[PDB]
Design a protein around this ligand. Structure first.
Ligand code: CLA
Ligand code: CLA
Ligand code: CLA
Ligand code: CLA
Ligand code: CLA
Ligand code: CLA
Ligand code: CLA
Ligand SMILES: CCCCCCCCCCCCCCCCCC(=O)OC[C@H](CO[C@@H]1O[C@H](CO)[C@H](O)[C@H](O)[C@H]1O)OC(=O)CCCCCCCCCCCCCCCCC
Ligand SMILES: C/C(C=C=C1C(C)(C)C[C@H](O)C[C@@]1(C)O)=C/C=C/C(C)=C/C=C/C=C(C)/C=C/C=C(/C=C/[C@@]12O[C@]1(C)C[C@@H](O)CC2(C)C)CO
Ligand SMILES: CC(/C=C/C=C(C)/C=C/[C@@]12O[C@]1(C)C[C@@H](O)CC2(C)C)=C\C=C\C=C(C)\C=C\C=C(C)\C=C\[C@@]12O[C@]1(C)C[C@@H](O)CC2(C)C
Lengths: 168, 177
């Protein structure tokens, strides 16, 4: 009762405390008719994709790969990269990763034990015990949400005003 | 048995004494509506939202007309017509404000319906007391009465300002003198 985020709204009844980044924020009750693991996986995937996208947009408006095709702004880079076939390679490998993801999310939903977003990818450690893993999961979630909103703002401002890196 | 405000009318059944500003002024018996998701809880929440919105709007009109606009913002003293001058030059501000108000209003409606269902939240309550001006009781009732009276007065005032600006196309205090 009385979820932490919205103090005047009831607790979403599906997010008690046992999830990283769980401040009880679900006013429209998306968790009431969708699996929690599915939504967590979707959120983490969005976080990672948008973090990579924000970093790439900002960097590519500064540094360009050698070649005349890579001499466009990130706003206009989509139509150039799709014509050159640059985005085709990313599409192919992302589709391979996403088919393996289809298998992984299916197994997670039907038992297994794989945590949402846990691909066990960890060449370095950066997370030795449970406490470090929880803290870094919270950091990843917060940074990913911030980067999703940041990429949203960057794209909207760049489309509104065709400016360089300062999209004001 | 008779309403305090209207002695020629019987006391409205649903308005005993609880809500701040209750004087029994329900001649049409609207407090007894229990259909289309509308009841005393919904009516009180709507009244409080109207009170707060009217207070904010009246304060904004008076502030802008007396102390002038903020730097970088248009002038004209007609608040119903300066809106189109702001939108003509800063449409993004208006759009962002509208989107924020839309999200907050969706949250407000969800909260109203939930609090009506599992009764734990008083109508118009959003737990918004950052400065702790209404922590203790015996002052909360007085603050509720002050808010309700000021909000009704500002509702009437803001409706008047809207109509005056739409019709006369002049400022509020311009109409005053
Ligand atoms: C969402 C991810 C994403 C997407 C869709 C793109 C898309 C694009 N980038 Mg880009 N970029 C990204 C992230 C991304 N970038 C990141 C994170 C960086 C920082 C290193 C850059 C740095 C960058 C530069 C410097 C340039 C581009 C350019 C371009 C355009 C054409 C060439 C190209 O594909 O990039 C080539 C990308 C690189 C050389 C660096 C990519 C490094 C990756 C993203 C990090 C490692 C992630 C890993 C491989 C994930 C594995 C995927 C899995 C399925 C196997 C194209 C529109 C070029 C352009 O035309 O600019 C307008 C260009 O000059 N990008
Ligand atoms: C702020 C950035 C950030 C942070 C803190 C994390 C944090 C984490 N990621 Mg992660 N990730 C990110 C961005 C980030 N991610 C992005 C942009 C991608 C897309 C390429 C991924 C893709 C990814 C995969 C595929 C996996 C993780 C995993 C993990 C966990 C263990 C690995 C680790 O300690 O990462 C350390 C990261 C940093 C110190 C960031 C600094 C890098 C410069 C941990 C919760 C693993 C997991 O789920 O474990 C539970 C896992 O399998 N991440
Ligand atoms: C992530 C946080 C973040 C931050 C720091 C900013 C920061 C800014 N935004 Mg912004 N914005 C964001 C998210 C953010 N935005 C999101 C999620 C959206 C919706 C997609 C927008 C939509 C938006 C619009 C439509 C406009 C800004 C504008 C601005 C600037 C005023 C300022 C630099 C304004 C600006 O200067 O654009 C040129 C403007 O007009 N933003
Ligand atoms: C665009 C997004 C949006 C959304 C989704 C909502 C959603 C809601 N608003 Mg709302 N509101 C918004 C924007 C929005 N608002 C804005 C921009 C303002 C002005 C700042 C308001 C001012 C406002 C007030 C003052 C009230 C609401 C109320 C409500 C709730 C009742 C909805 C209903 O049945 O109305 C149906 C829609 C109608 C237009 C019916 C109203 C018709 C009247 C008679 C018009 C009278 C005009 C005369 C001159 C609902 C949660 C009410 C509430 O919470 O009650 C509990 C309430 O009293 N809203
Ligand atoms: C119902 C509440 C309400 C509404 C809808 C508005 C609406 C508006 N005000 Mg405003 N205002 C209000 C209450 C309100 N005010 C109050 C209570 C005060 C006193 C603190 C002010 C003080 C004020 C000033 C000083 C100025 C405005 C201005 C504006 C206009 C552009 C700013 C904007 O988009 O607002 C959203 C802005 C933010 C969220 C920030 C817009 C028509 C500007 C304008 O163009 O006036 C002509 C301006 O200069 N207002
Ligand atoms: C005459 C002005 C006035 C007064 C006396 C109050 C009084 C009150 N408001 Mg309130 N309010 C007002 C204007 C006012 N409001 C306006 C214009 C808005 C719109 C922004 C709000 C939005 C608002 C919310 C969202 C909430 C309150 C709440 C409250 C109650 C507890 C907070 C408190 O002590 O505030 C004292 C206020 C002052 C001393 C005004 C000083 C200027 C209290 C009865 C809370 C409540 O009802 O809790 C049950 C609550 O959640 N108010
Ligand atoms: C809240 C209290 C309040 C106050 C102090 C005023 C005061 C005023 N109104 Mg007014 N008005 C109000 C509420 C109020 N109104 C309401 C609730 C509405 C309906 C929404 C109106 C609709 C209204 C109109 C349509 C007109 C006035 C006009 C006037 C002015 C002329 C007064 C008169 O007797 O002329 C007679 C005066 C400054 C008139 C004006 O501006 O004169 C030039 C005018 O045309 N008012
Ligand atoms: C606008 C569309 C109206 C939507 C109606 C929703 C509910 C309204 C309603 O049913 O109550 C309609 C209200 C409620 O009327 C009340 O009903 C109660 C029992 O339900 C009690 O009988 C009250 O005594 C009675 O007054 O009546 C009126 O407001 C009629 C006033 C008409 C004045 C014309 C001038
Ligand atoms: C279904 C729903 C929402 C909901 C729900 C949920 C989501 C299901 C959740 C719950 O469970 C139930 C329920 C029902 O709550 C309904 C949504 C509400 C609506 C339909 C929104 C309406 C808002 C309209 C407003 C507030 C417009 C005001 C216009 C003004 C104009 C201003 C002007 O300046 C302009 C522009 C020109 C100037 O010249 C002069 C004037 C004219 C003054 C003043 O502001
Ligand atoms: C800034 C913003 C969001 C900021 C979010 C932040 C900081 C989030 C922080 C967190 O996530 C972290 C970091 C960690 C989480 O655990 C906790 C929180 C705290 C939640 C959203 C802006 C959101 C801004 C929005 C939605 C603006 C919308 C504007 C519109 C629609 C206007 C459109 C128009 O103006 C045009 C474009 C042209 C005109 O011609 C037509 C019209 C329509 C007038």
């Amino acid at each position: 009762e009385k979820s932490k985020a919205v103090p005047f709204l009831p607790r979403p009844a599906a997010l008690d405390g046992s999830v990283v980044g769980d401040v009880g924020f679900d006013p429209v009750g998306f968790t009431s008719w969708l699996p929690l693991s599915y939504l967590q996986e979707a959120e983490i995937k969005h976080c990672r994709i948008a973090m990579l996208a924000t970093l790439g947009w900002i960097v590519a408006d500064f540094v360009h790969l050698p070649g005349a095709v890579h001499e466009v702004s990130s706003l206009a880079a989509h139509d150039v990269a799709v014509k050159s076939g640059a985005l085709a390679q990313i599409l192919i490998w992302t589709s391979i990763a996403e088919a393996i993801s289809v298998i992984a999310i299916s197994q997670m939903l039907e038992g297994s034990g794989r945590q949402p977003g846990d691909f066990k990818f960890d060449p370095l450690n950066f997370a030795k015990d449970e406490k470090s893993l929880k803290k870094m999961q919270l950091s990843e979630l917060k940074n990913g949400r911030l980067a999703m909103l940041a990429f949203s703002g960057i794209v909207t401002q760049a489309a509104l005003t065709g400016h360089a890196f300062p999209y004001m | 048995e008779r309403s305090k405000s209207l002695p020629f009318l019987m006391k409205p059944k649903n308005l005993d004494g609880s809500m701040a500003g209750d004087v029994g002024f329900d001649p049409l018996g609207l407090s007894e509506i229990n259909d289309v998701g509308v009841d005393l809880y919904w009516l009180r929440e709507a009244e409080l939202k109207h009170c707060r919105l009217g207070m904010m709007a009246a304060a904004g009109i008076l502030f802008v007309e007396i102390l002038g606009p903020a730097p970088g913002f248009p002038a004209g003293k007609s608040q119903m017509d300066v809106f189109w001058k702001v939108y003509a030059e800063k449409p993004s501000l208006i759009g962002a404000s509208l989107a924020a108000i839309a999200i907050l209003e969706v949250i407000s409606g969800v909260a109203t319906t939930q609090g009506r269902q599992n009764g734990d939240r008083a109508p118009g309550d959003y737990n918004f007391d950052p400065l702790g001006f209404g922590k203790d009781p015996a002052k909360f009732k007085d603050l509720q009465l002050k808010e309700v009276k000021n909000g009704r007065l500002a509702m009437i005032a803001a409706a008047g300002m809207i109509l005056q600006g739409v019709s006369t196309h002049q400022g509020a205090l311009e109409n005053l003198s």
